[PDB]
Design an enzyme around this catalytic site. Structure first.
Site, PDB file in Angstrom:
ATOM      1  N   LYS A   1      -6.803  -5.100  -3.005  1.00  0.00           N
ATOM      2  CA  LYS A   1      -7.501  -5.659  -1.858  1.00  0.00           C
ATOM      3  C   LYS A   1      -8.512  -4.666  -1.314  1.00  0.00           C
ATOM      4  CE  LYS A   1      -3.686  -4.399   1.226  1.00  0.00           C
ATOM      5  NZ  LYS A   1      -4.446  -3.444   2.072  1.00  0.00           N
TER       6      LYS A   1
ATOM      7  N   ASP B   1       0.782  -1.240   0.000  1.00  0.00           N
ATOM      8  CA  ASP B   1       0.000   0.000   0.000  1.00  0.00           C
ATOM      9  C   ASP B   1       0.817   1.295   0.000  1.00  0.00           C
ATOM     10  OD1 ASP B   1      -2.827  -1.237   1.985  1.00  0.00           O
ATOM     11  OD2 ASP B   1      -2.032  -1.801   0.011  1.00  0.00           O
TER      12      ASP B   1
ATOM     13  N   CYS C   1      -1.831  -2.906   7.613  1.00  0.00           N
ATOM     14  CA  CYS C   1      -1.716  -3.735   6.422  1.00  0.00           C
ATOM     15  C   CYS C   1      -0.413  -4.504   6.421  1.00  0.00           C
ATOM     16  CB  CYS C   1      -1.957  -2.926   5.139  1.00  0.00           C
ATOM     17  SG  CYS C   1      -3.644  -2.331   5.171  1.00  0.00           S
TER      18      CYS C   1
HETATM   19  O1  LIG Z   1      -2.720  -0.001   4.492  1.00  0.00           O
HETATM   20  C1  LIG Z   1      -3.160  -0.001   5.674  1.00  0.00           C
HETATM   21  O2  LIG Z   1      -2.452  -0.251   6.702  1.00  0.00           O
HETATM   22  C2  LIG Z   1      -4.624   0.436   5.828  1.00  0.00           C
HETATM   23  C3  LIG Z   1      -5.589   0.153   4.851  1.00  0.00           C
HETATM   24  N1  LIG Z   1      -6.850   0.563   4.988  1.00  0.00           N
HETATM   25  C4  LIG Z   1      -7.171   1.266   6.062  1.00  0.00           C
HETATM   26  C5  LIG Z   1      -6.216   1.556   7.027  1.00  0.00           C
HETATM   27  N2  LIG Z   1      -4.967   1.152   6.902  1.00  0.00           N
END
Ligand SMILES: O=C(O)c1cnccn1
Ligand SMILES: [Cl-]
Ligand SMILES: [Cl-]
Ligand SMILES: [Cl-]
Ligand SMILES: [Zn+2]
Length: 212
Positions: free
Chosen positions: A112, A14, A157
């Site tokens: 995802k 991410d 994540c």
């Molecule tokens: O990538 C992450 O850690 C994440 C993803 N969605 C919401 C909050 N955090």
């Protein structure tokens, strides 16, 4: 370069506009890890990128729950869910990779969190603990048995991806200085504790880069 063997993969979690300064769920200083990630990726034969990829009606957004505000928690069918600002909506600038991310050799982009009613911090398994993402099957078909995890956020994540990798039988390592955390109600130190307990190896980029 003296690359890592064919049985290992780097999973870059991410590294998106939404989680970096300027984004809708900006983690402070999270952009500063990107040069390290770019350099690390060159040292691996196999690199997978993950992308949080939410529809506009996603259950993880506080805005889709009357009377709830970001960073509060809600009990869903599958357990406790942290609610967030709207972030990384499919096809938007927020969901794009950070412009400093430069990994032309990356072989897969796995999205995802695309099921409206289920979050998926982990790139391996969704928040229901049962819906498998396909990543395990992909990696094992390719002969990968070791996974190194970097990215954002260390305590969500990254941690959930690493913990799921262990549950699926992978040797799992997290490269600490190539991650950045958010630390909600002590989540950061707890993530490190739970990861260490489960046999995730905590390493620094110099440990890998000194054998590349
Ligand atoms: O990538 C992450 O850690 C994440 C993803 N969605 C919401 C909050 N955090
Ligand atoms: Cl919002
Ligand atoms: Cl946009
Ligand atoms: Cl499944
Ligand atoms: Zn998300």
């Amino acid at each position: 370069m003296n690359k890592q063997p064919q049985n290992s993969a780097l999973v870059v979690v991410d590294v998106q506009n939404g989680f970096t300064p300027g984004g809708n769920l900006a983690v402070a200083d999270a952009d500063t890890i990107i040069p390290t990630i770019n350099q690390l990726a060159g040292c691996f034969e196999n690199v997978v990128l993950t992308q949080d990829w939410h529809p506009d009606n996603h259950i993880s957004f506080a805005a889709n729950h009357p009377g709830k505000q970001p960073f509060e928690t809600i009990e869903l069918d599958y357990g406790s869910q942290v609610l967030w600002p709207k972030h990384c909506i499919q096809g938007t600038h927020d969901a794009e990779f950070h412009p400093d991310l430069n990994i032309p050799t990356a072989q897969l982009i796995i999205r995802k969190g695309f099921h409206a009613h289920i979050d998926s911090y982990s790139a391996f398994m969704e928040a229901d603990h049962t819906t498998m993402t396909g990543l395990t099957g992909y990696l094992k078909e390719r002969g990968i048995d070791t996974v190194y995890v970097v990215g954002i956020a260390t305590d969500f994540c990254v941690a959930w991806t690493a913990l799921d990798a262990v549950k699926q039988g992978f040797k799992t390592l997290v490269i600490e200085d190539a991650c950045k955390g958010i630390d909600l109600n002590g989540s950061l130190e707890q993530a490190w504790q739970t990861m260490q307990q489960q046999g995730v190896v905590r390493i620094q980029s110099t440990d890998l880069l000194n054998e590349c």
